[PDB]
């Protein structure tokens, strides 16, 4: 389960980089797995097993109840400002099994909003307004397009705002080079901290330095700084085993100066190809078995989309993401 | 003196302590999209 979620996060990350090897990445693994686990409440047979194995659960060792309860407890763990919500937007005439709507509310905290997708601009605005509210205005356009024949959309959002334990002073932020490669740079506002003592590990074998910066309360961020031109080689080593080794190797070190850019990045993704590469196939096909939603094998996934935003500044950071699973008739 | 200078591509990971799930992950290849 911990192992599953870490294995899933790094498997997904590697597929995102393969698809767009020259772009920034920001995403939320937990948003994606929660949306897909929500979907799996309604899946059967091969459609189900592919989703849950794609999320990296071992179905010989873990039951579906254990999986859904892990997301229920995670949702409690999330709800410093941290929030996560789930919703289903459903054509009002679509007949839904009581078990599906009850389990969605109990396990995922999801209501069912009757939605007229044939009035597609209004349906799109309702979903986008739901996500805008959940993300405190940071994600306004999760849904770019919505087919008038859509039957259901499952939505997850996450919002995380935190203050640094040791905030940067804006008077120490100065324009400095950020090297895109050995020969080319861009100028960025470079924040700095001085004379701090934090967890640190120089990994000479993997040509990278790892540190932890704390937030207030009980959260922190793991940073991995590859030597120049070693990012791809570090990425190839991402795994539960490597992350655990890094965590086990951190020791407190006095740092004279730490420099971190002030910046915001965002990414929007179509995850269809990504999820197929993870083995989630039948849900998208004419053979989809989502018969736990309606009682009939009459629904298939059309698209899974994800958007995420990261803002790093002197006082703290803000992170938000959302995932939508669009479903049509077969 | 140890200096840590994030002036080239780097990764960040938010790991939840209550579950050890990864809530967010990023690669910063260019801070100015
Ligand atoms: Ca077991
Ligand atoms: Ca080196
Ligand atoms: Ca290289
Ligand atoms: Cl879209
Ligand atoms: Cl090397
Ligand atoms: Cl991150």
Short mmCIF file of N, CA, C and O in Angstrom, two decimals, chain A residues 9-140:
data_model
loop_
_atom_site.label_atom_id
_atom_site.label_comp_id
_atom_site.label_asym_id
_atom_site.label_seq_id
_atom_site.Cartn_x
_atom_site.Cartn_y
_atom_site.Cartn_z
N UNK A 9 3.73 6.08 -8.03
CA UNK A 9 4.19 7.44 -8.26
C UNK A 9 5.38 7.45 -9.20
O UNK A 9 5.43 8.24 -10.15
N UNK A 10 6.38 6.59 -8.95
CA UNK A 10 7.59 6.62 -9.77
C UNK A 10 7.35 6.01 -11.14
O UNK A 10 7.91 6.47 -12.13
N UNK A 11 6.48 5.03 -11.25
CA UNK A 11 6.14 4.46 -12.55
C UNK A 11 5.43 5.52 -13.43
O UNK A 11 5.74 5.67 -14.56
N UNK A 12 4.52 6.24 -12.82
CA UNK A 12 3.83 7.31 -13.53
C UNK A 12 4.80 8.44 -13.95
O UNK A 12 4.84 8.82 -15.05
N UNK A 13 5.67 8.81 -13.03
CA UNK A 13 6.64 9.87 -13.28
C UNK A 13 7.52 9.52 -14.48
O UNK A 13 7.67 10.28 -15.38
N UNK A 14 7.98 8.29 -14.50
CA UNK A 14 8.85 7.89 -15.60
C UNK A 14 8.12 7.93 -16.93
O UNK A 14 8.71 8.28 -17.96
N UNK A 15 6.83 7.58 -16.95
CA UNK A 15 6.07 7.66 -18.21
C UNK A 15 5.83 9.12 -18.62
O UNK A 15 5.85 9.46 -19.81
N UNK A 16 5.60 10.01 -17.66
CA UNK A 16 5.42 11.42 -18.01
C UNK A 16 6.67 11.98 -18.65
O UNK A 16 6.60 12.74 -19.62
N UNK A 17 7.85 11.63 -18.11
CA UNK A 17 9.10 12.15 -18.65
C UNK A 17 9.39 11.57 -20.03
O UNK A 17 9.90 12.27 -20.90
N UNK A 18 9.09 10.28 -20.23
CA UNK A 18 9.28 9.67 -21.54
C UNK A 18 8.43 10.36 -22.59
O UNK A 18 8.88 10.58 -23.73
N UNK A 19 7.20 10.72 -22.24
CA UNK A 19 6.30 11.35 -23.20
C UNK A 19 6.74 12.77 -23.54
O UNK A 19 6.56 13.21 -24.68
N UNK A 20 7.30 13.50 -22.58
CA UNK A 20 7.71 14.89 -22.79
C UNK A 20 9.05 15.13 -22.12
O UNK A 20 9.14 15.71 -21.02
N UNK A 21 10.12 14.62 -22.72
CA UNK A 21 11.40 14.57 -22.01
C UNK A 21 12.01 15.92 -21.73
O UNK A 21 12.89 15.99 -20.88
N UNK A 22 11.54 16.99 -22.37
CA UNK A 22 12.13 18.31 -22.21
C UNK A 22 11.29 19.28 -21.39
O UNK A 22 11.63 20.46 -21.32
N UNK A 23 10.22 18.82 -20.73
CA UNK A 23 9.35 19.70 -19.95
C UNK A 23 9.52 19.54 -18.43
O UNK A 23 9.93 18.49 -17.95
N UNK A 24 9.21 20.62 -17.70
CA UNK A 24 8.98 20.57 -16.26
C UNK A 24 7.90 19.52 -15.99
O UNK A 24 7.03 19.28 -16.81
N UNK A 25 7.95 18.93 -14.80
CA UNK A 25 6.91 18.03 -14.33
C UNK A 25 6.38 18.56 -13.01
O UNK A 25 7.14 18.91 -12.11
N UNK A 26 5.06 18.61 -12.89
CA UNK A 26 4.41 18.71 -11.59
C UNK A 26 3.15 17.85 -11.67
O UNK A 26 2.37 17.99 -12.63
N UNK A 27 2.96 16.94 -10.73
CA UNK A 27 1.74 16.14 -10.71
C UNK A 27 1.50 15.64 -9.29
O UNK A 27 2.38 15.70 -8.42
N UNK A 28 0.29 15.13 -9.08
CA UNK A 28 -0.08 14.52 -7.80
C UNK A 28 -0.39 13.04 -7.99
O UNK A 28 -1.49 12.68 -8.47
N UNK A 29 0.50 12.14 -7.57
CA UNK A 29 0.19 10.71 -7.65
C UNK A 29 -1.07 10.33 -6.90
O UNK A 29 -1.87 9.54 -7.41
N UNK A 30 -1.26 10.89 -5.71
CA UNK A 30 -2.42 10.52 -4.90
C UNK A 30 -3.72 10.98 -5.54
O UNK A 30 -4.75 10.30 -5.43
N UNK A 31 -3.73 12.13 -6.23
CA UNK A 31 -4.95 12.54 -6.91
C UNK A 31 -5.32 11.52 -7.99
O UNK A 31 -6.49 11.12 -8.13
N UNK A 32 -4.34 11.10 -8.78
CA UNK A 32 -4.57 10.15 -9.86
C UNK A 32 -5.00 8.80 -9.31
O UNK A 32 -5.98 8.19 -9.78
N UNK A 33 -4.30 8.29 -8.31
CA UNK A 33 -4.69 6.97 -7.80
C UNK A 33 -6.04 7.02 -7.11
O UNK A 33 -6.82 6.06 -7.20
N UNK A 34 -6.37 8.12 -6.44
CA UNK A 34 -7.69 8.20 -5.82
C UNK A 34 -8.79 8.21 -6.88
O UNK A 34 -9.81 7.50 -6.73
N UNK A 35 -8.61 8.96 -7.97
CA UNK A 35 -9.62 8.98 -9.01
C UNK A 35 -9.78 7.61 -9.63
O UNK A 35 -10.89 7.18 -9.95
N UNK A 36 -8.66 6.91 -9.84
CA UNK A 36 -8.72 5.60 -10.47
C UNK A 36 -9.27 4.54 -9.51
O UNK A 36 -10.01 3.64 -9.94
N UNK A 37 -8.97 4.66 -8.22
CA UNK A 37 -9.54 3.73 -7.24
C UNK A 37 -11.04 3.96 -7.12
O UNK A 37 -11.83 3.00 -7.00
N UNK A 38 -11.48 5.22 -7.16
CA UNK A 38 -12.90 5.57 -7.25
C UNK A 38 -13.54 4.90 -8.45
O UNK A 38 -14.55 4.19 -8.32
N UNK A 39 -12.96 5.06 -9.64
CA UNK A 39 -13.47 4.38 -10.81
C UNK A 39 -13.61 2.87 -10.58
O UNK A 39 -14.60 2.25 -11.01
N UNK A 40 -12.62 2.28 -9.92
CA UNK A 40 -12.58 0.83 -9.76
C UNK A 40 -13.71 0.32 -8.87
O UNK A 40 -14.05 -0.86 -8.96
N UNK A 41 -14.32 1.19 -8.07
CA UNK A 41 -15.52 0.78 -7.34
C UNK A 41 -16.58 0.24 -8.29
O UNK A 41 -17.42 -0.57 -7.90
N UNK A 42 -16.60 0.71 -9.53
CA UNK A 42 -17.59 0.32 -10.50
C UNK A 42 -17.11 -0.67 -11.52
O UNK A 42 -17.86 -1.00 -12.44
N UNK A 43 -15.88 -1.16 -11.41
CA UNK A 43 -15.30 -2.04 -12.41
C UNK A 43 -15.41 -3.51 -12.01
O UNK A 43 -15.45 -3.85 -10.82
N UNK A 44 -15.45 -4.38 -13.01
CA UNK A 44 -15.43 -5.82 -12.79
C UNK A 44 -14.46 -6.51 -13.73
O UNK A 44 -14.00 -5.95 -14.74
N UNK A 45 -14.14 -7.77 -13.39
CA UNK A 45 -13.39 -8.68 -14.24
C UNK A 45 -12.08 -8.05 -14.68
O UNK A 45 -11.35 -7.54 -13.81
N UNK A 46 -11.70 -8.13 -15.95
CA UNK A 46 -10.38 -7.67 -16.37
C UNK A 46 -10.23 -6.17 -16.24
O UNK A 46 -9.12 -5.68 -15.95
N UNK A 47 -11.31 -5.42 -16.45
CA UNK A 47 -11.23 -3.97 -16.28
C UNK A 47 -10.77 -3.63 -14.88
O UNK A 47 -9.90 -2.77 -14.71
N UNK A 48 -11.34 -4.31 -13.88
CA UNK A 48 -10.96 -4.10 -12.49
C UNK A 48 -9.50 -4.49 -12.28
O UNK A 48 -8.76 -3.73 -11.62
N UNK A 49 -9.14 -5.72 -12.60
CA UNK A 49 -7.81 -6.17 -12.22
C UNK A 49 -6.75 -5.28 -12.85
O UNK A 49 -5.71 -5.01 -12.24
N UNK A 50 -6.98 -4.82 -14.09
CA UNK A 50 -5.99 -3.95 -14.72
C UNK A 50 -5.85 -2.62 -13.98
O UNK A 50 -4.73 -2.11 -13.84
N UNK A 51 -6.97 -2.04 -13.54
CA UNK A 51 -6.86 -0.78 -12.80
C UNK A 51 -6.05 -1.00 -11.53
O UNK A 51 -5.11 -0.26 -11.23
N UNK A 52 -6.42 -2.00 -10.74
CA UNK A 52 -5.80 -2.13 -9.42
C UNK A 52 -4.35 -2.57 -9.54
O UNK A 52 -3.51 -2.14 -8.74
N UNK A 53 -4.03 -3.42 -10.52
CA UNK A 53 -2.62 -3.76 -10.74
C UNK A 53 -1.86 -2.57 -11.32
O UNK A 53 -0.67 -2.40 -11.02
N UNK A 54 -2.53 -1.74 -12.12
CA UNK A 54 -1.90 -0.52 -12.62
C UNK A 54 -1.56 0.47 -11.53
O UNK A 54 -0.55 1.18 -11.63
N UNK A 55 -2.34 0.51 -10.47
CA UNK A 55 -2.05 1.29 -9.27
C UNK A 55 -1.01 0.64 -8.38
O UNK A 55 -0.67 1.19 -7.31
N UNK A 56 -0.53 -0.53 -8.77
CA UNK A 56 0.59 -1.24 -8.17
C UNK A 56 0.21 -1.99 -6.91
O UNK A 56 1.09 -2.36 -6.12
N UNK A 57 -1.07 -2.25 -6.70
CA UNK A 57 -1.49 -3.17 -5.65
C UNK A 57 -1.25 -4.61 -6.07
O UNK A 57 -1.38 -4.99 -7.24
N UNK A 58 -0.92 -5.42 -5.09
CA UNK A 58 -0.74 -6.85 -5.25
C UNK A 58 -2.06 -7.50 -4.86
O UNK A 58 -2.40 -7.57 -3.67
N UNK A 59 -2.82 -7.96 -5.86
CA UNK A 59 -4.18 -8.44 -5.60
C UNK A 59 -4.21 -9.83 -4.98
O UNK A 59 -5.26 -10.23 -4.48
N UNK A 60 -3.10 -10.56 -4.97
CA UNK A 60 -3.05 -11.80 -4.20
C UNK A 60 -2.89 -11.54 -2.71
O UNK A 60 -3.32 -12.38 -1.91
N UNK A 61 -2.33 -10.40 -2.32
CA UNK A 61 -2.10 -10.09 -0.92
C UNK A 61 -3.10 -9.11 -0.34
O UNK A 61 -3.22 -9.03 0.89
N UNK A 62 -3.83 -8.37 -1.17
CA UNK A 62 -4.67 -7.28 -0.70
C UNK A 62 -6.04 -7.38 -1.34
O UNK A 62 -6.15 -7.52 -2.57
N UNK A 63 -7.08 -7.31 -0.52
CA UNK A 63 -8.44 -7.32 -1.03
C UNK A 63 -8.87 -5.93 -1.49
O UNK A 63 -8.26 -4.91 -1.15
N UNK A 64 -9.97 -5.89 -2.25
CA UNK A 64 -10.52 -4.61 -2.68
C UNK A 64 -10.97 -3.78 -1.48
O UNK A 64 -10.80 -2.55 -1.47
N UNK A 65 -11.53 -4.42 -0.46
CA UNK A 65 -11.90 -3.67 0.74
C UNK A 65 -10.69 -3.00 1.38
O UNK A 65 -10.77 -1.84 1.81
N UNK A 66 -9.56 -3.71 1.46
CA UNK A 66 -8.37 -3.11 2.03
C UNK A 66 -7.91 -1.92 1.20
O UNK A 66 -7.43 -0.90 1.73
N UNK A 67 -8.06 -2.02 -0.12
CA UNK A 67 -7.64 -0.93 -0.98
C UNK A 67 -8.53 0.29 -0.77
O UNK A 67 -8.04 1.39 -0.52
N UNK A 68 -9.84 0.11 -0.83
CA UNK A 68 -10.73 1.26 -0.71
C UNK A 68 -10.66 1.88 0.68
O UNK A 68 -10.74 3.11 0.81
N UNK A 69 -10.50 1.07 1.72
CA UNK A 69 -10.33 1.62 3.07
C UNK A 69 -9.04 2.41 3.19
O UNK A 69 -9.00 3.43 3.90
N UNK A 70 -7.99 2.02 2.46
CA UNK A 70 -6.76 2.80 2.47
C UNK A 70 -6.97 4.19 1.88
O UNK A 70 -6.39 5.17 2.36
N UNK A 71 -7.81 4.30 0.84
CA UNK A 71 -8.11 5.61 0.29
C UNK A 71 -9.05 6.38 1.21
O UNK A 71 -8.93 7.61 1.36
N UNK A 72 -9.99 5.69 1.87
CA UNK A 72 -10.84 6.36 2.85
C UNK A 72 -10.00 6.94 3.98
O UNK A 72 -10.19 8.09 4.38
N UNK A 73 -9.06 6.15 4.52
CA UNK A 73 -8.23 6.66 5.60
C UNK A 73 -7.31 7.77 5.11
O UNK A 73 -7.05 8.75 5.82
N UNK A 74 -6.77 7.62 3.89
CA UNK A 74 -5.95 8.67 3.31
C UNK A 74 -6.74 9.97 3.19
O UNK A 74 -6.22 11.04 3.51
N UNK A 75 -8.00 9.88 2.77
CA UNK A 75 -8.83 11.07 2.64
C UNK A 75 -9.03 11.74 3.99
O UNK A 75 -9.08 12.97 4.10
N UNK A 76 -9.16 10.94 5.04
CA UNK A 76 -9.19 11.50 6.39
C UNK A 76 -7.84 12.11 6.75
O UNK A 76 -7.78 13.20 7.33
N UNK A 77 -6.75 11.44 6.38
CA UNK A 77 -5.42 11.97 6.66
C UNK A 77 -5.20 13.34 6.03
O UNK A 77 -4.56 14.21 6.63
N UNK A 78 -5.67 13.51 4.80
CA UNK A 78 -5.55 14.81 4.11
C UNK A 78 -6.40 15.96 4.68
O UNK A 78 -5.90 17.07 4.86
N UNK A 79 -7.68 15.69 4.95
CA UNK A 79 -8.59 16.68 5.48
C UNK A 79 -8.63 16.65 7.01
O UNK A 79 -7.67 17.03 7.67
N UNK A 80 -0.97 25.35 8.21
CA UNK A 80 -0.93 24.44 7.06
C UNK A 80 -2.34 24.08 6.61
O UNK A 80 -3.21 23.79 7.44
N UNK A 81 -2.58 24.11 5.30
CA UNK A 81 -3.89 23.84 4.73
C UNK A 81 -3.75 22.67 3.77
O UNK A 81 -2.94 22.71 2.84
N UNK A 82 -4.54 21.63 3.98
CA UNK A 82 -4.47 20.41 3.18
C UNK A 82 -5.89 19.93 3.00
O UNK A 82 -6.62 19.75 3.98
N UNK A 83 -6.30 19.76 1.76
CA UNK A 83 -7.64 19.29 1.51
C UNK A 83 -7.68 18.43 0.27
O UNK A 83 -6.87 18.58 -0.64
N UNK A 84 -8.64 17.50 0.25
CA UNK A 84 -8.88 16.66 -0.92
C UNK A 84 -10.37 16.36 -0.98
O UNK A 84 -10.98 16.08 0.04
N UNK A 85 -10.93 16.42 -2.19
CA UNK A 85 -12.32 16.09 -2.38
C UNK A 85 -12.50 15.24 -3.63
O UNK A 85 -11.67 15.26 -4.54
N UNK A 86 -13.61 14.52 -3.64
CA UNK A 86 -14.04 13.72 -4.77
C UNK A 86 -15.49 14.03 -5.08
O UNK A 86 -16.28 14.28 -4.18
N UNK A 87 -15.86 13.95 -6.36
CA UNK A 87 -17.24 14.16 -6.78
C UNK A 87 -17.52 13.34 -8.03
O UNK A 87 -16.62 13.02 -8.82
N UNK A 88 -18.79 13.03 -8.25
CA UNK A 88 -19.25 12.43 -9.49
C UNK A 88 -20.33 13.31 -10.08
O UNK A 88 -21.25 13.76 -9.37
N UNK A 89 -20.18 13.63 -11.35
CA UNK A 89 -21.13 14.42 -12.13
C UNK A 89 -21.76 13.44 -13.10
O UNK A 89 -21.05 12.78 -13.86
N UNK A 90 -23.09 13.32 -13.06
CA UNK A 90 -23.78 12.20 -13.70
C UNK A 90 -25.00 12.70 -14.46
O UNK A 90 -25.78 13.48 -13.91
N UNK A 91 -25.19 12.20 -15.68
CA UNK A 91 -26.41 12.50 -16.43
C UNK A 91 -27.60 12.08 -15.58
O UNK A 91 -27.62 10.98 -15.03
N UNK A 92 -28.60 12.96 -15.46
CA UNK A 92 -29.65 12.71 -14.48
C UNK A 92 -30.46 11.46 -14.79
O UNK A 92 -30.93 10.79 -13.85
N UNK A 93 -30.60 11.09 -16.05
CA UNK A 93 -31.39 9.91 -16.42
C UNK A 93 -30.62 8.60 -16.31
O UNK A 93 -31.20 7.53 -16.53
N UNK A 94 -29.33 8.63 -15.99
CA UNK A 94 -28.55 7.41 -15.92
C UNK A 94 -28.85 6.67 -14.62
O UNK A 94 -28.77 7.26 -13.54
N UNK A 95 -29.21 5.39 -14.73
CA UNK A 95 -29.55 4.60 -13.55
C UNK A 95 -28.27 4.07 -12.92
O UNK A 95 -27.48 3.41 -13.60
N UNK A 96 -28.08 4.35 -11.63
CA UNK A 96 -26.88 3.97 -10.90
C UNK A 96 -27.23 2.98 -9.80
O UNK A 96 -28.24 3.13 -9.10
N UNK A 97 -26.37 1.98 -9.61
CA UNK A 97 -26.57 1.06 -8.50
C UNK A 97 -26.40 1.77 -7.17
O UNK A 97 -25.47 2.57 -6.97
N UNK A 98 -27.28 1.43 -6.23
CA UNK A 98 -27.17 1.99 -4.89
C UNK A 98 -25.84 1.65 -4.25
O UNK A 98 -25.27 2.47 -3.53
N UNK A 99 -25.31 0.45 -4.48
CA UNK A 99 -24.02 0.09 -3.90
C UNK A 99 -22.93 1.05 -4.36
O UNK A 99 -22.06 1.43 -3.56
N UNK A 100 -22.95 1.44 -5.64
CA UNK A 100 -21.94 2.36 -6.16
C UNK A 100 -22.05 3.73 -5.50
O UNK A 100 -21.05 4.27 -5.00
N UNK A 101 -23.24 4.33 -5.50
CA UNK A 101 -23.37 5.66 -4.91
C UNK A 101 -23.13 5.65 -3.40
O UNK A 101 -22.52 6.58 -2.86
N UNK A 102 -23.55 4.58 -2.71
CA UNK A 102 -23.31 4.51 -1.28
C UNK A 102 -21.83 4.34 -0.98
O UNK A 102 -21.28 5.00 -0.09
N UNK A 103 -21.16 3.44 -1.71
CA UNK A 103 -19.74 3.22 -1.48
C UNK A 103 -18.93 4.46 -1.86
O UNK A 103 -17.96 4.80 -1.17
N UNK A 104 -19.33 5.15 -2.93
CA UNK A 104 -18.64 6.38 -3.31
C UNK A 104 -18.70 7.43 -2.20
O UNK A 104 -17.70 8.10 -1.90
N UNK A 105 -19.86 7.58 -1.56
CA UNK A 105 -19.99 8.54 -0.46
C UNK A 105 -19.21 8.07 0.76
O UNK A 105 -18.44 8.83 1.35
N UNK A 106 -19.35 6.79 1.12
CA UNK A 106 -18.75 6.28 2.35
C UNK A 106 -17.22 6.26 2.27
O UNK A 106 -16.53 6.66 3.21
N UNK A 107 -16.68 5.77 1.16
CA UNK A 107 -15.25 5.53 1.03
C UNK A 107 -14.51 6.73 0.46
O UNK A 107 -13.40 7.01 0.90
N UNK A 108 -15.11 7.45 -0.47
CA UNK A 108 -14.43 8.54 -1.19
C UNK A 108 -14.99 9.91 -0.84
O UNK A 108 -14.48 10.92 -1.32
N UNK A 109 -16.02 9.97 0.01
CA UNK A 109 -16.62 11.25 0.31
C UNK A 109 -17.26 11.94 -0.87
O UNK A 109 -17.37 13.17 -0.86
N UNK A 110 -17.74 11.19 -1.86
CA UNK A 110 -18.26 11.78 -3.08
C UNK A 110 -19.77 11.90 -3.07
O UNK A 110 -20.47 10.90 -2.89
N UNK A 111 -20.28 13.10 -3.37
CA UNK A 111 -21.67 13.27 -3.74
C UNK A 111 -21.85 12.94 -5.22
O UNK A 111 -20.88 12.77 -5.98
N UNK A 112 -23.11 12.82 -5.63
CA UNK A 112 -23.49 12.64 -7.02
C UNK A 112 -24.27 13.88 -7.45
O UNK A 112 -25.40 14.11 -6.98
N UNK A 113 -23.67 14.68 -8.33
CA UNK A 113 -24.30 15.87 -8.87
C UNK A 113 -24.95 15.54 -10.20
O UNK A 113 -24.27 15.19 -11.17
N UNK A 114 -26.27 15.66 -10.25
CA UNK A 114 -26.99 15.58 -11.52
C UNK A 114 -26.52 16.66 -12.46
O UNK A 114 -26.50 17.84 -12.11
N UNK A 115 -26.13 16.27 -13.68
CA UNK A 115 -25.47 17.16 -14.62
C UNK A 115 -26.05 16.94 -16.01
O UNK A 115 -26.20 15.79 -16.44
N UNK A 116 -26.39 18.02 -16.71
CA UNK A 116 -26.90 17.91 -18.07
C UNK A 116 -25.73 18.13 -19.03
O UNK A 116 -25.40 19.26 -19.40
N UNK A 117 -25.08 17.04 -19.44
CA UNK A 117 -23.94 17.17 -20.32
C UNK A 117 -24.31 17.62 -21.73
O UNK A 117 -23.44 18.07 -22.47
N UNK A 118 -25.59 17.52 -22.11
CA UNK A 118 -25.99 18.01 -23.43
C UNK A 118 -25.89 19.52 -23.51
O UNK A 118 -25.71 20.06 -24.60
N UNK A 119 -25.98 20.20 -22.37
CA UNK A 119 -25.66 21.62 -22.26
C UNK A 119 -24.20 21.67 -21.81
O UNK A 119 -23.87 21.90 -20.64
N UNK A 120 -23.30 21.45 -22.78
CA UNK A 120 -21.93 21.08 -22.44
C UNK A 120 -21.16 22.24 -21.82
O UNK A 120 -20.30 22.02 -20.97
N UNK A 121 -21.44 23.48 -22.25
CA UNK A 121 -20.75 24.62 -21.65
C UNK A 121 -21.13 24.78 -20.18
O UNK A 121 -20.28 25.11 -19.34
N UNK A 122 -22.40 24.54 -19.84
CA UNK A 122 -22.83 24.64 -18.46
C UNK A 122 -22.27 23.51 -17.62
O UNK A 122 -21.89 23.72 -16.46
N UNK A 123 -22.26 22.29 -18.16
CA UNK A 123 -21.67 21.16 -17.46
C UNK A 123 -20.18 21.40 -17.21
O UNK A 123 -19.67 21.17 -16.11
N UNK A 124 -19.46 21.87 -18.24
CA UNK A 124 -18.04 22.14 -18.09
C UNK A 124 -17.79 23.20 -17.03
O UNK A 124 -16.87 23.08 -16.21
N UNK A 125 -18.61 24.25 -17.02
CA UNK A 125 -18.44 25.30 -16.02
C UNK A 125 -18.72 24.78 -14.61
O UNK A 125 -18.01 25.17 -13.67
N UNK A 126 -19.73 23.93 -14.43
CA UNK A 126 -20.00 23.40 -13.10
C UNK A 126 -18.80 22.60 -12.58
O UNK A 126 -18.36 22.79 -11.44
N UNK A 127 -18.26 21.71 -13.41
CA UNK A 127 -17.13 20.90 -12.97
C UNK A 127 -15.92 21.78 -12.70
O UNK A 127 -15.22 21.62 -11.69
N UNK A 128 -15.64 22.70 -13.62
CA UNK A 128 -14.49 23.58 -13.43
C UNK A 128 -14.66 24.46 -12.19
O UNK A 128 -13.70 24.71 -11.48
N UNK A 129 -15.90 24.91 -11.91
CA UNK A 129 -16.14 25.72 -10.72
C UNK A 129 -15.96 24.88 -9.45
O UNK A 129 -15.48 25.38 -8.43
N UNK A 130 -16.36 23.60 -9.49
CA UNK A 130 -16.12 22.70 -8.37
C UNK A 130 -14.63 22.59 -8.08
O UNK A 130 -14.18 22.69 -6.93
N UNK A 131 -13.84 22.39 -9.13
CA UNK A 131 -12.39 22.25 -8.95
C UNK A 131 -11.76 23.59 -8.54
O UNK A 131 -10.87 23.62 -7.69
N UNK A 132 -12.22 24.69 -9.12
CA UNK A 132 -11.72 26.00 -8.71
C UNK A 132 -11.96 26.24 -7.23
O UNK A 132 -11.08 26.71 -6.52
N UNK A 133 -13.15 25.88 -6.75
CA UNK A 133 -13.42 26.04 -5.32
C UNK A 133 -12.49 25.17 -4.48
O UNK A 133 -11.90 25.64 -3.50
N UNK A 134 -12.34 23.90 -4.85
CA UNK A 134 -11.53 23.01 -4.06
C UNK A 134 -10.07 23.40 -4.02
O UNK A 134 -9.39 23.15 -3.03
N UNK A 135 -9.57 23.98 -5.11
CA UNK A 135 -8.17 24.38 -5.20
C UNK A 135 -7.97 25.86 -4.90
O UNK A 135 -6.92 26.42 -5.23
N UNK A 136 -8.96 26.51 -4.28
CA UNK A 136 -8.82 27.90 -3.82
C UNK A 136 -8.37 28.80 -4.97
O UNK A 136 -7.53 29.70 -4.81
N UNK A 137 -8.92 28.53 -6.15
CA UNK A 137 -8.71 29.34 -7.31
C UNK A 137 -7.52 28.97 -8.17
O UNK A 137 -7.31 29.58 -9.22
N UNK A 138 -6.74 27.95 -7.78
CA UNK A 138 -5.49 27.70 -8.47
C UNK A 138 -5.66 26.90 -9.75
O UNK A 138 -4.86 27.04 -10.68
N UNK A 139 -6.67 26.03 -9.84
CA UNK A 139 -6.94 25.25 -11.05
C UNK A 139 -8.32 25.64 -11.56
O UNK A 139 -9.33 25.22 -11.00
N UNK A 140 -8.36 26.41 -12.65
CA UNK A 140 -9.60 26.95 -13.15
C UNK A 140 -10.10 26.26 -14.41
O UNK A 140 -11.26 26.45 -14.77
#
